[PDB]
Design an enzyme around this catalytic site. Structure first.
Site, PDB file in Angstrom:
ATOM      1  N   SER A   1      13.668   4.966  54.549  1.00 22.48           N
ATOM      2  CA  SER A   1      14.062   5.124  53.141  1.00 22.48           C
ATOM      3  C   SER A   1      15.553   4.948  52.925  1.00 22.48           C
ATOM      4  O   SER A   1      16.355   5.617  53.568  1.00 22.48           O
ATOM      5  CB  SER A   1      13.659   6.510  52.623  1.00 22.48           C
TER       6      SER A   1
ATOM      7  N   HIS B   1      17.336  19.976  48.152  1.00 19.29           N
ATOM      8  CA  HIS B   1      16.246  19.690  49.057  1.00 19.29           C
ATOM      9  C   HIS B   1      15.163  20.770  49.124  1.00 19.29           C
ATOM     10  O   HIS B   1      14.211  20.648  49.889  1.00 19.29           O
ATOM     11  CB  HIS B   1      16.812  19.383  50.454  1.00 19.29           C
TER      12      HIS B   1
ATOM     13  N   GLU C   1      21.471  21.718  54.721  1.00 17.01           N
ATOM     14  CA  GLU C   1      20.824  21.807  56.027  1.00 17.01           C
ATOM     15  C   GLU C   1      21.464  22.790  56.986  1.00 17.01           C
ATOM     16  O   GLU C   1      22.676  22.993  56.982  1.00 17.01           O
ATOM     17  CB  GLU C   1      20.833  20.454  56.734  1.00 17.01           C
TER      18      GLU C   1
ATOM     19  N   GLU D   1      11.974  16.797  56.460  1.00 19.52           N
ATOM     20  CA  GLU D   1      12.434  16.737  57.846  1.00 19.52           C
ATOM     21  C   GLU D   1      11.745  17.715  58.790  1.00 19.52           C
ATOM     22  O   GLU D   1      12.144  17.848  59.950  1.00 19.52           O
ATOM     23  CB  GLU D   1      13.952  16.942  57.931  1.00 19.52           C
TER      24      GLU D   1
ATOM     25  N   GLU E   1      28.814  19.062  58.352  1.00 19.93           N
ATOM     26  CA  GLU E   1      28.735  17.768  57.693  1.00 19.93           C
ATOM     27  C   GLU E   1      28.975  17.919  56.204  1.00 19.93           C
ATOM     28  O   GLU E   1      28.562  18.903  55.598  1.00 19.93           O
ATOM     29  CB  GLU E   1      27.349  17.171  57.940  1.00 19.93           C
TER      30      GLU E   1
ATOM     31  N   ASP F   1      29.369  11.890  55.903  1.00 20.56           N
ATOM     32  CA  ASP F   1      28.105  11.241  55.565  1.00 20.56           C
ATOM     33  C   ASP F   1      28.308  10.577  54.215  1.00 20.56           C
ATOM     34  O   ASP F   1      28.581   9.391  54.162  1.00 20.56           O
ATOM     35  CB  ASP F   1      26.977  12.272  55.520  1.00 20.56           C
TER      36      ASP F   1
ATOM     37  N   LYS G   1      23.898   5.842  59.879  1.00 25.65           N
ATOM     38  CA  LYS G   1      22.599   5.538  59.278  1.00 25.65           C
ATOM     39  C   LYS G   1      22.543   4.018  59.208  1.00 25.65           C
ATOM     40  O   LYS G   1      23.209   3.405  58.367  1.00 25.65           O
ATOM     41  CB  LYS G   1      22.487   6.133  57.873  1.00 25.65           C
TER      42      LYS G   1
ATOM     43  N   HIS H   1      18.731   9.919  61.067  1.00 23.12           N
ATOM     44  CA  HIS H   1      17.458   9.480  60.529  1.00 23.12           C
ATOM     45  C   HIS H   1      17.610   9.532  59.016  1.00 23.12           C
ATOM     46  O   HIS H   1      18.682   9.872  58.515  1.00 23.12           O
ATOM     47  CB  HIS H   1      16.356  10.453  60.966  1.00 23.12           C
ATOM     48  N   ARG H   2      16.547   9.221  58.290  1.00 20.36           N
ATOM     49  CA  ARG H   2      16.575   9.292  56.834  1.00 20.36           C
ATOM     50  C   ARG H   2      15.469  10.254  56.438  1.00 20.36           C
ATOM     51  O   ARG H   2      14.688  10.673  57.300  1.00 20.36           O
ATOM     52  CB  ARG H   2      16.346   7.923  56.218  1.00 20.36           C
TER      53      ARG H   2
END
Lengths: 433, 433
Positions: A36, A157, A166, A209, A294, A319, A344, A372-373
């Site tokens: 994605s 999220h 996260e 995730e 991050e 990011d 990415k 990853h995405r």
């Protein structure tokens, strides 16, 4: 030589369509799937979506597939480029597109072919894909990465009151990748046992995730919960913590960050300034074994990025700040805004560009965390990318959901191939070289 | 001939270890992974777990891996059996084990080799795996199955008040598998949009199979929610509903079923008798387009199974009732207890046995629904199994999570191979033959 290139649509881990490329040489079939991306993105390569609201919620990729099939395929086959010529094949496609953001053909169209070509080139040379990527980036040796397991989520999220997006665990104290998987999963399951007891079985459900998202009121609770899990598992000290603040999602204006953005009429205390936010991180780093943060600030709040990178000694990951974009990477380098690039591949759109992006970061002292995405596939290419690029760290989801495990399992397979001479990044994951 | 067989541990979609077998012939490497089974099971083949509470929560599989590596491998290589001899290879391993439930070597040890051998045999014969399975089961033609998408969950599989464990949508009105994926995902996403609005974003989290589990109070609400989703998607009539009551999990004694088992001190109205439960199904079938109900009664409440199979005309699926066990299948056949076998390869332990189990059901008029397990891997073997066995129906999770999508994507790939001559089971999914 490429004898045949054929794309089709498959579905990612979230039920959305995505490009999958089949490429043939005399060696056979080499399949690659694209994760994605962003149809519209800040400085990232734009993934092509049809946008037809009726069809698959506007997320179909027939146009990208078409671009591969009757534009890229004919051209690259007629070009007479070998799958062994990564740089050239990728340049060809880039020339073919003609735009900086790959918006004419679609980054998802270009990357799918690029990944397939890479797998083919490795086969052409008779070496494993990781070894092939190592040689492409000029590495002589390879090293197994420390997995950054996503375990608890927040921000946009999920619901809850968690501002930070996260919370991850990094088994830096492990001796091998096998041990890292053992530690990571054991804690995951211990965390689930803790979450179900404290919040009930309903809080055991997972997100994109594979991480949990209990109705945690504050960021510190998230950290303490993880700490308890690490304790129950008996790995305190061998496991460290990482975070993805994604502060960009929660920035108002003029140095203002609202830790409670998830509420209308936020006239409460958590409407602090960047400097207060930075202090909050310092406090967190003191009490908790946080080794990587991050996106701690807005993707354009450079000044606070530099201040934090300057006085913390921990890893500061870019990011949204860098978006795997060399131009953005250069600026962050000049401003000393961060010390680690979240890589990415689909954000930049091709294998050589991804490798160059990494080499750029490394050349300037940064570390690189292969990422990853949210919408992944069963493709495990990045598992080989992280080992070959010798980055020492990969962020590919919780040890739950097979689009996550697909990668981890692959790294376990690579570890098996390397044998006793398989080096685990361990504590020097930041820059194992 | 098999030149080398090597097992290792990988992780399933739930973070637990599982066996993966690598098998070599002069054709190369053929890899197979085994899904989550039952260490202890009613009549099913027992998967071997180490049980060491410290190591991986007692779920490690080093013993099974060992069994493959230094017991099965040496023997089968020395046996001189070709990968083309499925029945014989499987019989060999069964002889090697010596138990009815494969408890000496482990069903997960035996199945891993069995799946690898099957993929190898297909390669040995130069045909696709589906075609190979077709020939093994004596089928001349193959047909693409109607996907049974898990969309809402309940029972022990989640919190909430839902008694019924699963609620699935079957795109029987689709013309092709491609269209079935389109319909299935569109409804999935429409269902998510409905769930987040009615229950909030936190209810959007998913379970093991990728389905949602909102705090729904009653089974009918689940059905209505699905109905609304189907409506929003605009597929009312083209999409039908399936259920997995798993009534075995909620049976008390002497014909008593407590629709509210998820509560201590259940002195409420939902403590009805099997006959009242059967009527409840009849009511549901009248109002909702329910075309299949799995495990509507206790795995041993045969009498009510027969009564319901006798007077309903819908599909009655046996799972806990039959446990892919020929002995159990025979009894259900004699008693006319059901009309469809849920096929779980790892429940019986080998490829030929699975095929025979299916052929048994078919011989007696039953349909067969190929099933996944809660703990799946990125292996897509069952996708080829459902097409080759011409069953017309596969239950491999919601169109979310790649261990689910891995299979669906494969079927999309097979559909591509068949071309225009690709038959979709559609309305006659129950027994397309």
């Amino acid at each position: 030589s490429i004898t045949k290139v054929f794309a089709r649509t498959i579905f990612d881990s979230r039920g959305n369509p995505t490009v999958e490329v089949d490429l043939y040489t005399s060696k056979g079939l080499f399949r690659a799937a694209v994760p994605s991306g962003a149809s519209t993105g800040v400085h990232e390569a734009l993934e092509m979506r049809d946008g037809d609201k009726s069809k698959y919620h506007g997320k179909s990729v027939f146009n990208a597939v078409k671009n591969v099939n009757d534009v890229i395929v004919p051209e690259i086959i007629k070009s007479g480029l070998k799958v062994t010529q990564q740089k050239e094949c990728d340049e060809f496609m880039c020339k073919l597109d003609g735009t900086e953001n790959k918006s004419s053909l679609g980054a998802n169209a270009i990357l799918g072919v690029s990944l397939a070509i890479c797998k083919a080139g490795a086969a052409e040379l008779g070496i494993p894909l990781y070894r092939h990527i190592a040689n492409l980036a000029n590495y002589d040796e390879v090293i197994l990465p420390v997995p950054a397991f996503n375990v608890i989520n927040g921000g946009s999220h999920a619901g809850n009151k968690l501002a930070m997006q996260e919370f991850m665990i990094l088994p830096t104290g492990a001796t091998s990748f096998t041990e890292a998987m053992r530690m990571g999963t054991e804690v995951y399951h211990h965390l689930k046992a803790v979450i179900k007891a404290r919040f009930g079985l309903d809080a055991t459900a997972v997100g994109d995730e594979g991480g949990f998202a209990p109705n945690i009121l504050n960021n510190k609770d998230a950290l303490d919960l993880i700490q308890e899990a690490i304790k129950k598992a008996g790995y305190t000290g061998k496991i460290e913590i990482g975070m993805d603040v994604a502060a960009s999602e929660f920035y108002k204006q003029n140095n203002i960050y609202d830790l409670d953005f998830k509420t209308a009429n936020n006239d409460g205390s958590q409407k602090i300034s960047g400097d207060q936010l930075r202090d909050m991180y310092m406090e967190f780093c003191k009490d908790f074994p946080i080794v990587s943060i991050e996106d701690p600030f807005d993707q354009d709040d450079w000044e606070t990025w530099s201040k934090m990178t300057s006085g913390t000694t921990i890893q500061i990951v870019g990011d949204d700040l860098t978006v795997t974009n060399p131009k953005r990477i250069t600026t962050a380098v000049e401003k000393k805004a961060c010390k680690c690039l979240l890589l990415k591949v689909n954000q930049i759109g091709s294998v050589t560009e991804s490798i160059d992006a990494h080499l750029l970061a490394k050349k300037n002292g940064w570390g690189t965390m292969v990422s990853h995405r949210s919408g992944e596939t069963e493709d495990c290419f990045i598992a080989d990318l992280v080992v070959g690029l010798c980055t020492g760290q990969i962020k590919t989801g919780a040890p739950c959901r097979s689009e996550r495990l697909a990668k981890y399992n692959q790294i376990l397979r690579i570890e098996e191939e390397l044998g006793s001479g398989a080096k685990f990044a361990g504590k020097n994951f930041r820059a194992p070289s």
